[model samples]
Target: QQLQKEEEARKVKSGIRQMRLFSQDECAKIEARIDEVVSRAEKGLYNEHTVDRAPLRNKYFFGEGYTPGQERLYPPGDVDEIPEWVHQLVIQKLVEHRVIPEGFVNSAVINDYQPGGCIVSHVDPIHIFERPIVSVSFFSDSALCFGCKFQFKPIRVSEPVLSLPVRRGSVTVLSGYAADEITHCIRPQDIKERRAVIILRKTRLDAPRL
Candidate 1:
Protein backbone atom coordinates (compact mmCIF):
# COMPACT_ATOMS: atom_id res chain seq x y z
CA GLN A 1 0.00 0.00 0.00
CA GLN A 2 2.80 2.41 0.82
CA LEU A 3 4.56 1.74 -2.51
CA GLN A 4 1.36 2.23 -4.48
CA LYS A 5 0.66 5.48 -2.70
CA GLU A 6 4.18 6.75 -3.44
CA GLU A 7 3.75 5.97 -7.11
CA GLU A 8 0.41 7.76 -7.22
CA ALA A 9 1.92 10.83 -5.61
CA ARG A 10 4.65 10.96 -8.20
CA LYS A 11 2.06 10.88 -10.99
CA VAL A 12 0.00 13.72 -9.54
CA LYS A 13 2.88 16.17 -9.21
CA SER A 14 4.31 15.79 -12.71
CA GLY A 15 1.15 17.06 -14.45
CA ILE A 16 2.26 15.28 -17.60
CA ARG A 17 0.49 12.28 -19.12
CA GLN A 18 2.63 9.62 -20.81
CA MET A 19 1.81 6.52 -22.83
CA ARG A 20 3.78 3.99 -24.83
CA LEU A 21 1.88 4.20 -28.06
CA PHE A 22 4.11 2.57 -30.66
CA SER A 23 6.22 -0.47 -31.25
CA GLN A 24 9.89 -0.41 -32.23
CA ASP A 25 9.02 -1.36 -35.79
CA GLU A 26 6.40 1.33 -36.06
CA CYS A 27 8.75 4.04 -34.84
CA ALA A 28 11.39 2.93 -37.32
CA LYS A 29 9.03 3.47 -40.21
CA ILE A 30 8.06 6.90 -38.94
CA GLU A 31 11.69 7.91 -38.55
CA ALA A 32 12.45 6.97 -42.14
CA ARG A 33 9.65 9.12 -43.45
CA ILE A 34 10.81 12.12 -41.46
CA ASP A 35 14.35 11.68 -42.71
CA GLU A 36 13.11 11.67 -46.27
CA VAL A 37 11.40 15.01 -45.81
CA VAL A 38 14.50 16.66 -44.39
CA SER A 39 16.84 15.24 -46.99
CA ARG A 40 14.68 16.10 -49.98
CA ALA A 41 14.04 19.72 -49.13
CA GLU A 42 16.25 22.19 -50.99
CA LYS A 43 17.17 24.22 -47.92
CA GLY A 44 16.47 21.41 -45.47
CA LEU A 45 14.00 21.48 -42.61
CA TYR A 46 15.83 23.82 -40.23
CA ASN A 47 14.80 27.45 -39.84
CA GLU A 48 16.68 30.65 -39.17
CA HIS A 49 15.67 31.94 -35.77
CA THR A 50 14.31 35.46 -35.57
CA VAL A 51 16.08 36.86 -32.55
CA ASP A 52 19.66 35.71 -33.03
CA ARG A 53 19.42 35.54 -36.81
CA ALA A 54 21.15 32.19 -36.35
CA PRO A 55 20.02 28.86 -37.67
CA LEU A 56 17.99 26.88 -35.21
CA ARG A 57 17.93 23.11 -34.85
CA ASN A 58 16.63 20.69 -37.45
CA LYS A 59 12.85 20.89 -37.49
CA TYR A 60 9.88 20.80 -39.84
CA PHE A 61 6.50 22.47 -39.35
CA PHE A 62 3.14 21.37 -40.71
CA GLY A 63 -0.45 22.58 -40.76
CA GLU A 64 -0.20 25.97 -39.02
CA GLY A 65 3.39 27.04 -38.50
CA TYR A 66 4.90 27.88 -35.11
CA THR A 67 5.65 31.55 -34.52
CA PRO A 68 8.29 31.23 -31.79
CA GLY A 69 9.29 34.82 -31.03
CA GLN A 70 5.85 36.36 -31.83
CA GLU A 71 7.81 38.47 -34.37
CA ARG A 72 9.27 36.38 -37.22
CA LEU A 73 6.44 34.28 -38.61
CA TYR A 74 7.50 30.93 -39.93
CA PRO A 75 5.16 30.58 -42.83
CA PRO A 76 3.28 27.37 -43.55
CA GLY A 77 4.85 25.00 -46.04
CA ASP A 78 3.44 24.28 -49.48
CA VAL A 79 2.61 20.76 -48.31
CA ASP A 80 1.13 22.04 -45.09
CA GLU A 81 -1.16 19.07 -44.72
CA ILE A 82 -0.16 16.43 -42.20
CA PRO A 83 0.93 13.48 -44.23
CA GLU A 84 -1.66 10.72 -44.70
CA TRP A 85 0.90 8.16 -43.57
CA VAL A 86 1.30 9.87 -40.23
CA HIS A 87 -2.42 10.57 -39.87
CA GLN A 88 -3.11 6.86 -40.20
CA LEU A 89 -0.28 5.68 -37.98
CA VAL A 90 0.24 8.34 -35.35
CA ILE A 91 -2.86 10.54 -35.13
CA GLN A 92 -5.17 7.55 -35.35
CA LYS A 93 -3.47 5.87 -32.41
CA LEU A 94 -3.53 9.08 -30.37
CA VAL A 95 -7.24 9.40 -31.02
CA GLU A 96 -7.92 5.78 -30.11
CA HIS A 97 -6.16 6.35 -26.81
CA ARG A 98 -8.13 9.56 -26.31
CA VAL A 99 -4.95 11.55 -25.91
CA ILE A 100 -6.50 13.89 -28.46
CA PRO A 101 -9.67 13.82 -30.48
CA GLU A 102 -9.75 13.55 -34.23
CA GLY A 103 -9.71 16.82 -36.24
CA PHE A 104 -8.53 18.82 -33.23
CA VAL A 105 -4.87 19.01 -34.20
CA ASN A 106 -3.80 21.78 -36.57
CA SER A 107 -0.10 22.46 -35.98
CA ALA A 108 2.91 20.18 -35.64
CA VAL A 109 6.70 20.43 -35.44
CA ILE A 110 9.07 17.55 -36.01
CA ASN A 111 12.48 17.93 -34.43
CA ASP A 112 15.77 16.10 -34.44
CA TYR A 113 18.19 16.52 -31.55
CA GLN A 114 21.67 15.41 -32.40
CA PRO A 115 23.77 13.98 -29.61
CA GLY A 116 24.69 16.72 -27.13
CA GLY A 117 22.10 19.08 -28.58
CA CYS A 118 19.72 20.79 -26.18
CA ILE A 119 16.73 23.13 -26.24
CA VAL A 120 16.50 26.24 -24.07
CA SER A 121 13.87 26.40 -21.34
CA HIS A 122 10.59 28.12 -22.01
CA VAL A 123 6.92 27.27 -22.26
CA ASP A 124 5.22 27.39 -25.63
CA PRO A 125 3.90 30.93 -25.95
CA ILE A 126 0.52 30.57 -24.26
CA HIS A 127 -1.18 33.29 -26.24
CA ILE A 128 -0.44 31.48 -29.51
CA PHE A 129 -1.23 27.92 -28.48
CA GLU A 130 -3.98 26.04 -26.66
CA ARG A 131 -3.67 23.59 -23.79
CA PRO A 132 -2.54 19.97 -23.82
CA ILE A 133 0.51 20.08 -26.04
CA VAL A 134 1.31 16.60 -27.34
CA SER A 135 4.55 14.93 -28.41
CA VAL A 136 5.85 11.54 -29.44
CA SER A 137 9.48 10.44 -29.21
CA PHE A 138 11.62 8.05 -31.16
CA PHE A 139 15.17 6.60 -31.28
CA SER A 140 16.31 7.68 -27.81
CA ASP A 141 15.36 7.72 -24.17
CA SER A 142 15.95 11.36 -23.28
CA ALA A 143 15.08 13.57 -20.36
CA LEU A 144 12.86 16.67 -20.41
CA CYS A 145 13.59 18.80 -17.37
CA PHE A 146 11.02 21.10 -15.81
CA GLY A 147 11.34 23.93 -13.34
CA CYS A 148 10.20 27.48 -12.68
CA LYS A 149 13.67 29.01 -12.49
CA PHE A 150 16.79 27.82 -14.31
CA GLN A 151 20.46 28.54 -14.02
CA PHE A 152 22.52 28.93 -17.14
CA LYS A 153 26.15 29.46 -18.15
CA PRO A 154 26.29 30.96 -21.61
CA ILE A 155 24.54 28.26 -23.70
CA ARG A 156 24.77 25.58 -21.04
CA VAL A 157 21.89 24.72 -18.65
CA SER A 158 22.37 23.83 -15.01
CA GLU A 159 20.09 22.02 -12.61
CA PRO A 160 16.30 22.06 -13.01
CA VAL A 161 13.83 21.23 -10.24
CA LEU A 162 12.63 17.96 -11.73
CA SER A 163 12.77 15.78 -14.81
CA LEU A 164 10.68 13.13 -16.53
CA PRO A 165 12.08 10.32 -18.61
CA VAL A 166 10.97 10.71 -22.22
CA ARG A 167 10.97 7.15 -23.43
CA ARG A 168 11.39 6.05 -27.01
CA GLY A 169 8.26 5.03 -28.88
CA SER A 170 6.15 6.87 -26.34
CA VAL A 171 3.65 9.72 -26.40
CA THR A 172 3.66 12.49 -23.80
CA VAL A 173 0.98 15.09 -23.13
CA LEU A 174 1.86 18.29 -21.32
CA SER A 175 -0.88 20.37 -19.64
CA GLY A 176 -1.55 22.43 -16.56
CA TYR A 177 1.56 23.52 -14.67
CA ALA A 178 3.76 21.35 -16.80
CA ALA A 179 2.61 23.24 -19.87
CA ASP A 180 2.05 26.77 -18.62
CA GLU A 181 3.53 27.42 -15.18
CA ILE A 182 6.94 25.83 -15.47
CA THR A 183 9.60 25.93 -18.16
CA HIS A 184 10.95 22.77 -19.76
CA CYS A 185 14.24 22.10 -21.52
CA ILE A 186 16.48 19.33 -22.75
CA ARG A 187 19.98 19.80 -21.41
CA PRO A 188 22.88 18.59 -23.51
CA GLN A 189 24.16 16.22 -20.87
CA ASP A 190 20.88 14.31 -20.83
CA ILE A 191 20.99 13.07 -24.40
CA LYS A 192 23.09 10.06 -25.39
CA GLU A 193 21.69 9.24 -28.82
CA ARG A 194 20.00 10.96 -31.69
CA ARG A 195 16.60 11.97 -30.33
CA ALA A 196 13.67 12.69 -32.57
CA VAL A 197 10.36 14.11 -31.43
CA ILE A 198 7.09 15.11 -33.08
CA ILE A 199 5.16 17.85 -31.27
CA LEU A 200 1.48 18.55 -31.90
CA ARG A 201 -0.71 21.43 -30.82
CA LYS A 202 -3.72 23.53 -31.79
CA THR A 203 -3.34 27.19 -32.62
CA ARG A 204 -5.20 29.67 -30.48
CA LEU A 205 -7.96 31.69 -32.18
CA ASP A 206 -5.78 34.80 -32.01
CA ALA A 207 -2.50 33.15 -33.02
CA PRO A 208 -0.45 34.92 -35.68
CA ARG A 209 -0.93 34.10 -39.34
CA LEU A 210 0.59 34.80 -42.75
Candidate 2:
Protein backbone atom coordinates (compact mmCIF):
# COMPACT_ATOMS: atom_id res chain seq x y z
CA GLN A 1 0.00 0.00 0.00
CA GLN A 2 0.98 3.63 -0.38
CA LEU A 3 1.39 4.12 3.35
CA GLN A 4 3.82 1.21 3.52
CA LYS A 5 5.85 2.68 0.66
CA GLU A 6 6.04 6.05 2.35
CA GLU A 7 7.18 4.45 5.57
CA GLU A 8 9.96 2.57 3.80
CA ALA A 9 11.12 5.70 2.07
CA ARG A 10 11.24 7.57 5.34
CA LYS A 11 13.64 4.97 6.71
CA VAL A 12 16.11 5.87 3.99
CA LYS A 13 18.57 8.54 5.03
CA SER A 14 18.49 11.99 3.51
CA GLY A 15 21.00 12.66 0.76
CA ILE A 16 21.26 16.14 2.24
CA ARG A 17 23.52 15.86 5.28
CA GLN A 18 24.66 18.18 8.08
CA MET A 19 27.80 18.54 10.20
CA ARG A 20 26.73 19.22 13.74
CA LEU A 21 29.00 21.15 16.06
CA PHE A 22 31.62 22.64 13.80
CA SER A 23 34.73 23.83 15.63
CA GLN A 24 34.01 26.81 17.85
CA ASP A 25 36.88 28.67 16.29
CA GLU A 26 35.56 28.00 12.79
CA CYS A 27 32.10 29.02 13.90
CA ALA A 28 33.38 32.28 15.34
CA LYS A 29 35.29 33.04 12.17
CA ILE A 30 32.34 32.33 9.89
CA GLU A 31 29.95 34.27 12.13
CA ALA A 32 32.24 37.28 12.06
CA ARG A 33 32.40 37.20 8.27
CA ILE A 34 28.62 36.84 8.08
CA ASP A 35 28.23 39.79 10.43
CA GLU A 36 30.28 41.96 8.08
CA VAL A 37 28.10 41.09 5.08
CA VAL A 38 24.88 41.58 7.08
CA SER A 39 26.12 44.87 8.45
CA ARG A 40 26.62 46.23 4.95
CA ALA A 41 23.27 44.85 3.83
CA GLU A 42 21.42 46.43 6.75
CA LYS A 43 22.94 49.82 5.87
CA GLY A 44 21.50 49.70 2.29
CA LEU A 45 25.07 49.52 0.95
CA TYR A 46 24.27 46.31 -0.93
CA ASN A 47 21.48 45.75 -3.47
CA GLU A 48 17.94 46.57 -2.33
CA HIS A 49 14.87 44.30 -2.24
CA THR A 50 13.88 44.40 -5.88
CA VAL A 51 11.86 41.21 -6.46
CA ASP A 52 8.65 43.28 -7.01
CA ARG A 53 5.19 42.98 -5.40
CA ALA A 54 5.48 39.38 -4.34
CA PRO A 55 4.89 40.37 -0.70
CA LEU A 56 5.72 36.77 0.12
CA ARG A 57 9.36 37.22 -0.96
CA ASN A 58 12.34 39.30 0.11
CA LYS A 59 15.63 38.70 -1.71
CA TYR A 60 18.96 40.40 -2.50
CA PHE A 61 21.72 39.07 -4.69
CA PHE A 62 25.44 39.70 -5.06
CA GLY A 63 26.84 39.33 -8.60
CA GLU A 64 26.40 40.39 -12.23
CA GLY A 65 23.08 38.55 -12.51
CA TYR A 66 20.02 39.38 -14.59
CA THR A 67 16.38 38.44 -14.40
CA PRO A 68 14.63 39.80 -17.48
CA GLY A 69 11.49 41.85 -16.72
CA GLN A 70 12.49 41.75 -13.07
CA GLU A 71 15.18 44.39 -13.28
CA ARG A 72 14.17 45.85 -9.94
CA LEU A 73 15.05 42.54 -8.32
CA TYR A 74 18.04 41.71 -10.49
CA PRO A 75 20.66 44.35 -9.94
CA PRO A 76 23.83 44.26 -12.03
CA GLY A 77 27.02 42.57 -10.79
CA ASP A 78 29.45 43.34 -7.96
CA VAL A 79 28.56 39.81 -6.83
CA ASP A 80 32.22 39.02 -6.94
CA GLU A 81 32.68 41.69 -4.32
CA ILE A 82 31.15 39.50 -1.59
CA PRO A 83 33.51 39.13 1.35
CA GLU A 84 36.57 36.99 0.56
CA TRP A 85 36.16 34.81 3.63
CA VAL A 86 32.68 33.73 2.58
CA HIS A 87 33.89 32.92 -0.93
CA GLN A 88 36.85 31.01 0.45
CA LEU A 89 34.63 28.87 2.65
CA VAL A 90 32.39 27.95 -0.26
CA ILE A 91 35.35 27.12 -2.48
CA GLN A 92 36.88 24.89 0.16
CA LYS A 93 33.63 22.93 0.50
CA LEU A 94 33.18 22.62 -3.28
CA VAL A 95 36.72 21.37 -3.69
CA GLU A 96 36.29 18.87 -0.90
CA HIS A 97 33.12 17.46 -2.45
CA ARG A 98 34.21 17.81 -6.10
CA VAL A 99 30.80 19.36 -6.75
CA ILE A 100 32.05 22.14 -9.02
CA PRO A 101 35.00 23.18 -11.12
CA GLU A 102 37.56 25.31 -9.37
CA GLY A 103 37.08 29.08 -9.70
CA PHE A 104 33.36 28.88 -10.40
CA VAL A 105 31.69 30.54 -7.41
CA ASN A 106 30.18 33.83 -8.59
CA SER A 107 27.05 34.99 -6.76
CA ALA A 108 24.96 34.91 -3.58
CA VAL A 109 21.38 35.74 -2.47
CA ILE A 110 20.42 36.57 1.08
CA ASN A 111 16.83 36.08 2.27
CA ASP A 112 15.61 37.46 5.58
CA TYR A 113 12.49 36.35 7.41
CA GLN A 114 10.63 37.50 10.47
CA PRO A 115 8.16 35.36 12.37
CA GLY A 116 5.24 34.23 10.14
CA GLY A 117 7.34 34.55 6.96
CA CYS A 118 7.24 31.61 4.58
CA ILE A 119 8.27 30.67 1.04
CA VAL A 120 5.65 28.76 -0.86
CA SER A 121 6.67 25.48 -2.48
CA HIS A 122 8.93 25.95 -5.48
CA VAL A 123 11.84 24.38 -7.29
CA ASP A 124 15.13 26.08 -8.04
CA PRO A 125 15.07 25.65 -11.78
CA ILE A 126 18.07 24.69 -13.88
CA HIS A 127 17.73 27.94 -15.81
CA ILE A 128 18.63 29.83 -12.65
CA PHE A 129 22.07 28.23 -12.58
CA GLU A 130 23.74 25.20 -14.14
CA ARG A 131 25.63 24.59 -10.91
CA PRO A 132 24.20 23.54 -7.57
CA ILE A 133 23.06 26.02 -4.91
CA VAL A 134 24.88 26.18 -1.60
CA SER A 135 22.79 27.53 1.28
CA VAL A 136 23.97 28.54 4.74
CA SER A 137 21.60 29.36 7.60
CA PHE A 138 22.16 31.73 10.48
CA PHE A 139 20.32 33.14 13.52
CA SER A 140 17.47 30.98 14.93
CA ASP A 141 15.92 27.81 13.54
CA SER A 142 12.98 26.69 11.41
CA ALA A 143 11.32 23.66 9.82
CA LEU A 144 12.05 22.95 6.13
CA CYS A 145 9.30 21.29 4.12
CA PHE A 146 9.67 19.12 1.00
CA GLY A 147 7.57 16.61 -0.91
CA CYS A 148 7.08 14.72 -4.16
CA LYS A 149 4.99 15.84 -7.13
CA PHE A 150 1.40 14.75 -7.89
CA GLN A 151 0.84 13.00 -4.63
CA PHE A 152 -2.69 13.34 -3.32
CA LYS A 153 -1.43 13.20 0.24
CA PRO A 154 -1.03 16.43 2.17
CA ILE A 155 2.41 18.02 2.10
CA ARG A 156 3.81 18.36 5.58
CA VAL A 157 7.11 19.14 7.24
CA SER A 158 6.96 15.84 9.17
CA GLU A 159 7.07 14.03 5.84
CA PRO A 160 10.33 15.62 4.74
CA VAL A 161 13.29 13.28 4.41
CA LEU A 162 15.31 16.04 5.97
CA SER A 163 13.21 18.02 8.40
CA LEU A 164 16.18 19.66 9.93
CA PRO A 165 16.25 22.19 12.74
CA VAL A 166 18.36 24.73 10.88
CA ARG A 167 20.43 26.81 13.29
CA ARG A 168 23.20 29.37 13.26
CA GLY A 169 26.09 28.34 10.99
CA SER A 170 24.10 25.48 9.47
CA VAL A 171 25.21 24.62 5.92
CA THR A 172 23.20 22.72 3.30
CA VAL A 173 24.08 21.84 -0.28
CA LEU A 174 21.38 21.30 -2.87
CA SER A 175 22.78 19.28 -5.77
CA GLY A 176 22.23 16.18 -7.90
CA TYR A 177 18.59 15.05 -7.99
CA ALA A 178 17.80 17.15 -4.96
CA ALA A 179 18.48 20.34 -6.84
CA ASP A 180 17.25 19.12 -10.20
CA GLU A 181 13.76 18.01 -9.19
CA ILE A 182 12.70 18.32 -5.56
CA THR A 183 10.73 21.38 -4.36
CA HIS A 184 11.38 22.78 -0.90
CA CYS A 185 10.65 25.73 1.36
CA ILE A 186 10.93 27.02 4.90
CA ARG A 187 7.94 27.58 7.22
CA PRO A 188 8.90 29.56 10.29
CA GLN A 189 6.83 29.20 13.43
CA ASP A 190 4.87 32.25 14.55
CA ILE A 191 7.21 33.30 17.31
CA LYS A 192 9.26 36.42 17.88
CA GLU A 193 12.50 35.37 16.16
CA ARG A 194 14.43 36.23 13.03
CA ARG A 195 15.85 33.87 10.42
CA ALA A 196 18.46 34.62 7.78
CA VAL A 197 19.57 32.47 4.89
CA ILE A 198 22.22 32.96 2.21
CA ILE A 199 22.25 31.06 -1.06
CA LEU A 200 25.46 30.98 -3.11
CA ARG A 201 25.32 29.81 -6.70
CA LYS A 202 27.81 29.25 -9.52
CA THR A 203 26.81 30.32 -13.01
CA ARG A 204 27.75 28.14 -15.94
CA LEU A 205 29.92 29.67 -18.61
CA ASP A 206 27.82 27.97 -21.30
CA ALA A 207 24.36 28.84 -19.96
CA PRO A 208 22.21 30.80 -22.38
CA ARG A 209 22.04 34.55 -21.84
CA LEU A 210 18.63 36.16 -21.69
Q: After superposition, how far is residue 63 of candidate 2 from its true place, in Å?
A: 2.4
- Over the stretch 34-99, how does candidate 2's per-residue lDDT look in tens digits? 567656666667644322123444565666454532222233453335556656765576557665
> Using alpha carbons, what is the TM-score of model 1?
0.81
Clashes (candidate 2): 5
lDDT (C-alpha) at residue 22 in model 2:
37
Q: What is the TM-score of each candidate against the true structure?
A: 0.81, 0.68
* lDDT (CA) per prediction: 0.74, 0.57
lDDT by residue (tens digit), candidate 1, 165-201: 9999989899886787777888788877788888888
Which candidate has the top score in lDDT? 1
lDDT of 2 at 23: 47
Give the clashing pairs for model 1: none
